[PDB]
Amino acid sequence: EVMLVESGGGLVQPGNSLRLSCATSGFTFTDYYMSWVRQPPGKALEWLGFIRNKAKGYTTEYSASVKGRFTISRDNSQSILYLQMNTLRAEDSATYYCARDISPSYGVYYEGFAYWGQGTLVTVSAATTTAPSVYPLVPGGSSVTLGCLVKGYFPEPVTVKWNYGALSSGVRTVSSVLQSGFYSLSSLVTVPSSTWPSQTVICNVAHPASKTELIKRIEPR
Amino acid sequence: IVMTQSPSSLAVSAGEKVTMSCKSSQSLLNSRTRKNYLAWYQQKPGQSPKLLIYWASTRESGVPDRFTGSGSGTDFTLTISSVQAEDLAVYYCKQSNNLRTFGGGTKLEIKRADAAPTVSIFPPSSEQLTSGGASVVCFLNNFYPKDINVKWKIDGSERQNGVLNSWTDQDSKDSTYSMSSTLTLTKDEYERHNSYTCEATHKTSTSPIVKSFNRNE
Numbered sequence: 001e002v003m004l005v006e007s008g009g010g011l012v013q014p015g016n017s018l019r020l021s022c023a024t025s026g027f028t029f030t031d032y033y034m035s036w037v038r039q040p041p042g043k044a045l046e047w048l049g050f051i052r053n054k055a056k057g058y059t060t061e062y063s064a065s066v067k068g069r070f071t072i073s074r075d076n077s078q079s080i081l082y083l084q085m086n087t088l089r090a091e092d093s094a095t096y097y098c099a100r101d102i103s104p105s106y107g108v109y110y111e112g113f114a115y116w117g118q119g120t121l122v123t124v125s126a127a128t129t130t131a132p133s134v135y136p137l138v139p140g141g142s143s144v145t146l147g148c149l150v151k152g153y154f155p156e157p158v159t160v161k162w163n164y165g166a167l168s169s170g171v172r173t174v175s176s177v178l179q180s181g182f183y184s185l186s187s188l189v190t191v192p193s194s195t196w197p198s199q200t201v202i203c204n205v206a207h208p209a210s211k212t213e214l215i216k217r218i219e220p221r
Numbered sequence: 222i223v224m225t226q227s228p229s230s231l232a233v234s235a236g237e238k239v240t241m242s243c244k245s246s247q248s249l250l251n252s253r254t255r256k257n258y259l260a261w262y263q264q265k266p267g268q269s270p271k272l273l274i275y276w277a278s279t280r281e282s283g284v285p286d287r288f289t290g291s292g293s294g295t296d297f298t299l300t301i302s303s304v305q306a307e308d309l310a311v312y313y314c315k316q317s318n319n320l321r322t323f324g325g326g327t328k329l330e331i332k333r334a335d336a337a338p339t340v341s342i343f344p345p346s347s348e349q350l351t352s353g354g355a356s357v358v359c360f361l362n363n364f365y366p367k368d369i370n371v372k373w374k375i376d377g378s379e380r381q382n383g384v385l386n387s388w389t390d391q392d393s394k395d396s397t398y399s400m401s402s403t404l405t406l407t408k409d410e411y412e413r414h415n416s417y418t419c420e421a422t423h424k425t426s427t428s429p430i431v432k433s434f435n436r437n438e
């Protein structure tokens with residue numbers, strides 16, 4: 001099992017710097033080039049640069065847009081890739097992926113990023129990091145639609161899970177909206193009226209920025 | 222190297238054929254390896270990009286043969302013989318002959334039969350009211366097409382200020398949309414009235430679907 005996990009994302013004030021890390025395992029780290037890729041919300045992927053394998057001396061290269069502003073390095077003993085981001089502005093607000101690049105020196109070689117990380121959102125703003133409030137959505141038939149209203153959080157994102165991930169069908173999560181410096185969104189799930197309130201329905205709202213999770217049991221009125 | 226894709230987005234019904242173009246400023250054919258260094262990546266909403274095609278035409282482990290990469294030099298094409306509900310995604314091409322460069326991407330959307338929404342309304346919660354808040358949410362579920370309208374009425378009068386709308390992505394299973402219309406009030410504004418109505422107007426009908434509740438309940 002090949003695995004890539006980015007870390008260090010979150011809120012960073014305009015002008016400041018940030019270092020992202022990409023823990024890896026499941027393959028010979030030193031054999032592979034490693035690339036960083038970013039993607040602003042609703043925008044296209046952008047290759048930022050890479051660092052070559054051991055055979056190539058771990059030499060770095062960067063796209064024209066980030067030259068002299070972003071730096072790449074790697075801890076070959078811990079198999080951890082890094083991304084040094086200096087002097088950040090709002091245009092740098094994006095999801096940052098690490099991807100396993102080519103390994104031309106040993107083993108199977110082919111042009112393509114075989115594996116990616118889940119990515120970590122970085123948002124550059126002078127605003128305040130504030131955890132969200134989670135309010136229940138319940139009716140005033142054969143099925144009932146419940147939900148969780150998530151308000152007043154910053155920055156993005158928040159993830160919502162129902163019954164700790166056990167309730168996965170009939171789930172609808174609408175995009176987030178920005179108003180007065182704060183985001184909000186609602187996630188809903190439809191279940192047989194025989195399932196609730198006879199049984200338990202909960203939503204788990206996670207806000208990575210503030211390292212905060214919130215559970216909200218859906219009770220009748 | 223400058224990568225450019227086309228179209229920026231397109232919508233086709235399930236079972237139809239589809240074609241996307243990828244263009245590069247420089248040739249991607251490497252005279253030494255005699256291969257085109259162009260890959261195609263699939264990215265579903267909220268997910269990381271997945272490799273589908275590499276070296277212009279070679280299919281990655283696990284990728285269905287419905288996907289076919291073609292072209293050479295500066296002209297490339299990704300083709301889907303028959304598109305299904307799973308294909309909802311943006312598709313990026315990427316040159317790797319000189320460093321790496323991603324294209325603009327092609328968003329693939331699916332056309333399907335029109336469907337009327339199931340409309341639910343939710344009075345504010347007790348805990349929100351406790352903090353002096355009052356959000357009224359009207360939820361329209363599983364409709365198509367995407368365009369849809371909601372009119373809010375309070376004690377019979379239309380309301381426009383304090384209203385926000387938000388859509389889900391096209392559903393990965395049935396390709397439908399859902400959207401919420403939230404009216405945000407203060408606990409005091411909310412308690413100044415009784416009747417709260419949301420009316421959903423969609424192409425599926427002339428008569429709007431109406432849901433209501435009285436605060437006196």
Ligand SMILES: N[C@@H]1[C@@H](O)[C@H](OP(=O)(O)O)[C@@H](CO[C@]2(C(=O)O)C[C@@H](O[C@]3(C(=O)O)C[C@@H](O)[C@@H](O)[C@@H]([C@H](O)CO)O3)[C@@H](O)[C@@H]([C@H](O)CO)O2)O[C@H]1O
Binds near residue numbers: 111253320
């Ligand atoms: N023009 C020369 C070629 O003669 C030479 O090929 P050869 O050994 O068969 O005669 C290539 C060698 O290619 C590599 C190699 O070790 O095979 C790989 C190159 O890889 C990259 C790179 O690191 O920048 C990355 C890859 O994705 C692709 O972008 C290629 C690029 O098309 C190659 O032009 O570049 C690279 O690491 C090279 C060294 O630069 C060798 O000088 O070695 O090299 C050509 O310059």
Ligand SMILES: [Mg+2]
Binds near residue numbers: 059060061
């Ligand atoms: Mg160099």
